[PDB]
């Protein structure tokens, strides 16, 4: 299971000002950037060309080059068609990719208007998603008249997207299968509740994403353990914290247990009150302003 996504964001401030920015993610590694400031899709990995030839890449890059300038000018004209209806500023988002599976896939192209998902390319044409505004019917009828675009979109969604990704997965096999070891430390904070403490188990610098983290008393996993969101790191690693709320006093005898692939069995076990936890804590002292109140 691997999802390849081209995310595009276009801003239209008024009748003349506009910018379109796009990024490209495979799984959760950014492979391509293309800023409005540049007229060239940039590789962000030494393997972002996949298994494509130079001449194969130029044709695809030019395809999109024509697209960017055409897209902008199309939206502008549609706004003019719905002159009194919709008006600036207008925000458009395109999410277009394909998900890989024994040589089988499913492609998609989703379009959003003002942060809301309204249109997708389904089969041979554009389609208004149930729960779309009724004013969109005309502009869709206008776009569907283009036999030429429909042809190119279909070729990309049906054939090109899957053919390209298969190339990226073998070209980027090395990077997508890499193993980075997480490091952990401990801390605490006042709970929202009177006379309670929230303990924090910081896990940072690990790859890949999936990871198990739990506060425990020996064999018993504390059920109150809350998983935080996964937070990014510049070097494409991950930061995740697991918290535990406790009544000031239950703190000792607890432990933070971290399981990850890159450890291979040797789990990280931080004990609240160990000579190691103590040495770490005095290395991180501070005036405590402006702490989160």
């Amino acid at each position, epitope marked *: 299971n691997y999802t390849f996504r081209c995310l595009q964001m276009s801003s239209f401030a008024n009748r003349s000002w506009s910018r379109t920015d796009s990024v490209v993610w495979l799984g959760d590694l950014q492979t391509h950037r293309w800023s409005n400031d540049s007229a060239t899709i940039s590789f962000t990995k030494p393997w972002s060309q996949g298994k494509l030839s130079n001449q194969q890449w130029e044709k695809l890059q030019h395809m999109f080059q*024509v697209y960017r300038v*055409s897209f902008t*000018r*199309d939206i502008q*004209e*549609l706004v*003019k*068609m719905m*002159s*009194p209806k919709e008006d600036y500023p207008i925000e458009i988002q395109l999410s277009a990719g394909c998900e890989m599976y024994g040589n089988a896939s499913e492609s998609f192209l989703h379009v959003a208007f003002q942060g809301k998902y309204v249109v997708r390319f389904w089969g041979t044409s554009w389609q208004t998603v149930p729960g779309a505004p009724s004013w969109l019917d005309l502009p869709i009828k*206008v*776009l569907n*008249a*283009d*036999q*030429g*675009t429909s042809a190119t979109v279909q070729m990309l969604l049906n054939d090109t997207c899957p053919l390209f990704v298969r190339g990226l997965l073998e070209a980027g096999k090395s990077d997508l299968e890499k193993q980075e070891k997480p490091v952990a430390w401990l801390s605490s904070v006042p709970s929202s509740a009177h006379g309670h403490r929230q303990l924090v188990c910081h896990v940072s610098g690990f790859y890949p994403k999936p990871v198990w983290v739990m506060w425990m008393r020996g064999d018993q996993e504390q059920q109150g353990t809350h998983r935080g969101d996964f937070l990014p790191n510049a070097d494409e690693t991950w930061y995740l914290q697991a918290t535990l709320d406790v009544e000031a006093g239950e703190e000792a005898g607890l432990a933070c247990r971290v399981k990850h692939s890159s450890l291979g069995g040797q789990d990280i076990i931080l004990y609240w009150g160990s000579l190691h936890h103590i040495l770490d804590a005095q290395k991180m002292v501070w005036n405590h302003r402006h702490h989160h109140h």
Partner: T-cell receptor
Amino acid sequence: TQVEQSPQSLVVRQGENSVLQCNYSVTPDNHLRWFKQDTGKGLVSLTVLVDQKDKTSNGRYSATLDKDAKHSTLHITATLLDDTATYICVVGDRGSALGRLHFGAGTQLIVIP
Amino acid sequence: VTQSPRNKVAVTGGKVTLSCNQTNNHNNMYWYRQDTGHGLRLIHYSYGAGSTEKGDIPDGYKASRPSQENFSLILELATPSQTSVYFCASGDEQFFGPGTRLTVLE
């Protein structure tokens, strides 16, 4: 200009073959169309060229398009007197209602009896 | 796709309207002008009843679309430079009107 035609004027003997050229730089290039304009009237569509390498044919008129060359050619086999008109090359950037046509300056065909 | 007037002699600073009427049920209409050495250039165009949009050279020109059928080019103050042959068009493939020869004098 984005649509260039050659020559300025073409003079052919009646009952011979006349050839007209068109060169464009319009990106993108959805289709191409040749119009006929009689002296003192409007433009009338002779033929369209849609494909990457297209070749159309209507009556004595026949046209060819090469989108990689960005170029087109109109042929009139066995030119008549009544073919004395201006011929206009037009390229249309989009294949929808949101398109914008680009007009060449035209070629004046004069047929000598 | 009818045009009226077919011919017009105007003075500098005089108000001139060029009408254009079509019964094809088309939403899009255009106003071009032809000048020797150039090839047709876009003045004003419309996406429907109540729409008017500037083209490549809208200066000295105003447009109006009262109904689906009609689309007029209004010249408030006329210039000698606005002496040209004006073509109207409709359609989504365009269809071109007979033309209007307009001379504006000092």
